[PDB]
């Protein structure tokens, strides 16, 4: 099957600047592409079909181009309603392969992450478990990087990493990082470490504590 | 006008079988392109035919009406599930959830600050919500009095079984002085819980 490459997951966007959207097909497609507009809780709204025609009721700040593997959508003047995922689409080979989709999202100043870390909770140790927990809030932009360190020791398996929606209020992003562990292992070792890289700091902000101290 | 409208989504067990139905009106049936995509974090948007004998699209005899069998279903499976009339027309999606978990009540934990003292102008707490099914619980804090400063996390699938969390975050001179609590409620369970974050005291 033809895959449908959107290198750009997430683009920051200004209300009244142009943005370009990418789409890159493996194979020749000639103009054989659809556009979609997708908000939360609905289905794909078709846009443009055959790469650069608009279907009817779309707002004409909204193009298509491109021919053979490379397309591009283009939103000129950008609105706040405008705010969605954004999936290109093949219909050269079925099936009519979907691109990976690209939100876009608003732009604002850089904010470094505040950065919380929070031991395994007593009730939880008596019930036979051990959870560390890691929030990192009202940052921006939204690349970030979360490391666990265990004496010292990069520790990789066993962490989950949920993310916030951009907030309508300041535009920021949250994260939350969360390493489980058994009992018997947490109790065993002594320091754990929270590094969170951000472009706002050349070096990591580090939050840790020893399970013995207080 | 064109309406699409998908039915018999839900909860389904693993190895399991689930036939979804879409009852269609606004042109004539059998002169329209019937087809079925879902999507899904992990995936995205599929066509249930890259999905490959799981999944068979067929018809009803007379009526308006398309369907799509599913057999031997795994957790990966679960998303939601588009009947569509390509490009233009979609229902409202169905969604379906493929899991073996009974079900379960969230165990609570408060999450007050590191024993050291970490101070400084703000103080953030958490409350975490961990192994419960199915979705949803409904996270609040003080009775929902406490709006500002919070940041409920999404919920992820750990084992077999959801957890979340969440954070808020107020001016040193409140907590603890001004009680904090986690309020979690899950229906499915029939279980409200509050859970009082209060400060960590050396073991
Ligand atoms: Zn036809
Ligand atoms: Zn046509």
């Known amino acids: 099957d033809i895959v449908m490459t959107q290198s750009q997951k997430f683009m920051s966007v200004t209300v009244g600047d142009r943005v370009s959207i990418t789409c890159k097909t493996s194979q020749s497609v000639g103009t054989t592409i659809v556009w979609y507009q997708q908000k939360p809780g609905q289905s794909p709204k078709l846009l443009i079909y055959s790469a650069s025609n608009r279907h009817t009721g779309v707002p004409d700040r909204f193009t298509g181009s491109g021919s053979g593997t490379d397309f591009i959508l283009t939103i000129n003047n950008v609105q706040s309603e405008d705010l969605a995922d954004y999936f290109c689409?093949?219909?050269?080979?079925?099936?009519?392969?979907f691109g990976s989709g690209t939100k876009l999202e608003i732009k604002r100043a850089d904010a470094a992450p505040t950065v919380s870390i929070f031991p395994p909770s007593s009730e939880q140790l008596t019930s036979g478990g051990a959870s560390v927990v890691c929030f990192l809030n009202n940052f921006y932009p939204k690349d970030i990087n979360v490391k666990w360190k265990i004496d010292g020791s990069e520790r990789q398996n066993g962490v989950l990493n949920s993310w916030t929606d951009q907030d309508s209020k300041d535009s920021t992003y949250s994260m939350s990082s969360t390493l489980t562990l058994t009992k018997d292992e947490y109790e065993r070792h002594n320091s754990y470490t929270c590094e969170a890289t951000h472009k706002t700091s050349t070096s990591p902000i580090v939050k840790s504590f020893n399970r013995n101290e207080c | 006008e064109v309406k699409l409208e998908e039915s018999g989504g839900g909860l389904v067990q693993p190895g399991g079988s689930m036939k979804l139905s879409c009852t269609a009106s606004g042109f004539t049936f059998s002169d329209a392109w019937m087809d079925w995509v879902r999507q899904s974090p992990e995936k995205g948007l599929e066509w249930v035919a890259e999905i490959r004998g799981r999944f068979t699209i067929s018809r009803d005899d007379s009526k308006n009406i398309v369907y799509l069998q599913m057999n031997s279903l795994r957790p990966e499976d679960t998303g939601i599930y588009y009947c569509?009339?390509?490009?233009?027309?979609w229902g409202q999606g169905t969604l379906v959830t493929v899991s073996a978990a009974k079900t379960t009540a969230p165990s609570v934990y408060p999450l007050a600050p590191v024993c050291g003292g970490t101070t400084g102008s703000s103080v953030t707490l958490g409350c975490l919500v961990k192994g419960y099914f199915p979705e949803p619980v409904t996270l609040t804090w003080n009775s929902g009095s406490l709006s500002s400063g919070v940041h409920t996390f999404p919920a992820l699938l750990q084992s077999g079984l959801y957890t979340l969390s969440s954070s808020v975050t107020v001016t040193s001179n409140t907590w603890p002085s001004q009680t904090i609590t986690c309020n979690v409620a899950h229906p499915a369970s029939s279980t409200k819980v509050d859970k009082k974050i209060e400060p960590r005291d050396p073991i």
């Open positions: 569509t009339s390509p490009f233009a027309y």
């Open positions: 689409q093949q219909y050269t080979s079925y099936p009519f392969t």
